[PDB]
Amino acid sequence: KKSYTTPKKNKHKRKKVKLAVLKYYKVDENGKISRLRRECPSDECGAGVFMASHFDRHYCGKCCLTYCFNK
Amino acid sequence: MLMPKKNRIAIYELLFKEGVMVAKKDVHMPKHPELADKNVPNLHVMKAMQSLKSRGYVKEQFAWRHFYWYLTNEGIQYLRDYLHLPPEIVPATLRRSR
Amino acid sequence: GGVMDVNTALQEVLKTALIHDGLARGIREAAKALDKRQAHLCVLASNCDEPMYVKLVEALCAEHQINLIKVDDNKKLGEWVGLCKIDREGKPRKVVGCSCVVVKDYGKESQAKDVIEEYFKCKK
Amino acid sequence: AIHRIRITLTSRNVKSLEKVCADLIRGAKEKNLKVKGPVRMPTKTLRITTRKTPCGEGSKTWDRFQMRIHKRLIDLHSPSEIVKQITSISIEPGVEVEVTIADA
Amino acid sequence: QQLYWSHPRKFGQGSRSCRVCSNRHGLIRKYGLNMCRQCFRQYAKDIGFIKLD
């Protein structure tokens, strides 16, 4: 019933860092498109999205419970 | 979000077709049966009608744990342009009551 | 509507393309659209960004589907988009340049949409 | 053919019930359908015995409420057409009727 | 967001709710009630009952 007493931490939601955008496609000569890491192989994935180059961990972020290679 | 952009349409289009919406007061509805078919897993009907009601365009009754939203003329104009519909279509009703 | 001038032609796209829901605005969504075969058109605009995308967009058009158009002055196409839908293309609440758009089958295939693209393709 | 067709009546009002039964026994006997009389079944008691006081305080009191239903049924044996024709009409009050194909 | 919001309610006094507003405390089931004893009284006149005894 009574008013909240002081904490010594609280922090809400992380700011989900303000990274530079699309460098995932590499151009060195045209019409060639130098892709880096493999684009996601599931049927429900569109395979136009990239997979994470996250070495010692390899994970599709479109997936959210499944498809985690690690080598 | 607040809710997807698919599930907005499915409420605003359904309202336009019957001319009226109704729902129940719950927060544990699993897929919202009783129309909008199996694509509203949460509040969404109540939450979107309330925002619409804030800006007029609808009236709202409530009685024995059931909402009742009545579309109005102003909202018909809005929804007609918002959903890119013919300049004269109302499929909700249009006849004289005898 | 148009007479197959380049400027009024890209306007005719956006009207029925909105209904078709073909608009992949932003470079990342444009890329995913055109890396897929859903796309059929690419339009670019004046540099407000890095010198990387101007190269890359031509590279993607090369491999998959050649269709590109370049029309300068980002504010034109930036004005043409709303914040949701029609209701103000003026709008000081928000207006910002697209810098590139990709459209899927160039929206609805109907009247003058068909002719504007067919006019360009045979000469390019 | 001639089928044993049972016209069940059910109500909560003894006036409204009984006169509607009489109408169907006249109209049947008038046409010589060999109608069989009412079989009055035991009237049943819904009882509700609950507090008369919200937020209990003061002398402890209660309140008996009751609803009395009534059932009774007239058995006919005649063609199912003229029965289902005449039955559903000529009913003024809010009194229910349930027609059965056969029971005997 | 979250991966939970709920926990088993399948029996007990929390998995049934009475029709005042989703009120409780005032455990009720009788003959198909789901109807609150305070308001039951106000529906003595309304149909279901007329008091006679």
Determine contact: A34 vs chain C, CB below 8 A: no
- Give the separation between CA B48 and CA B36, rounded to whole angstroms: 13
Asked if residue E14 lies in contact with residue E24, where contact means CB atoms within 8 angstroms, the answer is yes
Residue E6 to residues B3, B27, C115, E10, E23: CA-CA distances in angstroms? Answer: 20, 10, 57, 12, 19
Report the 10 Å Cβ neighbour count for C31. 24
Q: What is the DSSP letter of E5?
A: S
Q: Where residue E37 sits, what CATH number does that domain have?
A: 4.10.830.10
Total of domains in chain E: 1
Quote the DSSP letter at residue C45.
Answer: -
Resolution in units of Å: 3.0
C58 vs C70: CA distance, rounded Å: 11
d(CA C30, CA D28): 82
Going from the C-alpha of B34 to that of each of B27, B48, B70, the distances in angstroms are 15, 17, 18
Query: Do chains D and A have 3 or more beta-carbon pairs under 8 angstroms?
Result: no
Task: For C33-52, give one letter per residue: b (16+ CB within 10 A) or e.
Answer: bbbbebbbbbbbbbeeeeee
DSSP structure class, residue A39? B
Distance (Å, rounded) from C-alpha A36 to C-alpha A51?
10
Q: In terms of residue numbers, what domain contains E42?
A: 1-53
- Chains with 3 or more CB pairs under 8 A to chain E: B, D
CA–CA dist A5, A23 (Å, integer)? 48
DSSP D43-56: P-EEEEEEESSSS-
Q: Does A33 contact C at CB distance below 8 Å?
A: yes
Is there a contact between B56 and B73 (Cβ–Cβ < 8 Å)?
no
- CA-nearest of D39, D45, D12 to D25 is D39
The CATH number assigned to the domain holding B84 equals 1.10.10.10
Domain span including residue C74 = 1-124
For B7, the 3-state DSSP assignment is: helix
User: Based on the structure, what is the number of domains in chain C?
Assistant: 1
D and E interact (at least 3 Cβ pairs within 8 A)? yes
Tokens of E31: 């003959």
Q: Tell which residue, B89, B65, B87, has the closest CA to residue B13.
A: B89
Q: Which residues contact C16 (CB under 8 A, 6 or more apart)?
A: C107, C108, C110, C113
Q: Where are the alpha helices (DSSP H) in D1-78?
A: 14-29
Interchain pair E22, B64: CB under 8 A: no
Angle (CA) D64-D69-D73 rounded to 5° is 165
Provide the domain limits for residue B23.
Answer: 1-98
Rounded CA separation B72/A45 (Å): 42
What's the rounded Cα separation, in Å, for the pair C110 and C113?
7
Burial class from Cβ neighbours inside 10 Å (0-12, 13-18, 19+) for residue C94 reads exposed
Question: Chains meeting A at 3+ CB pairs closer than 8 A?
Answer: C
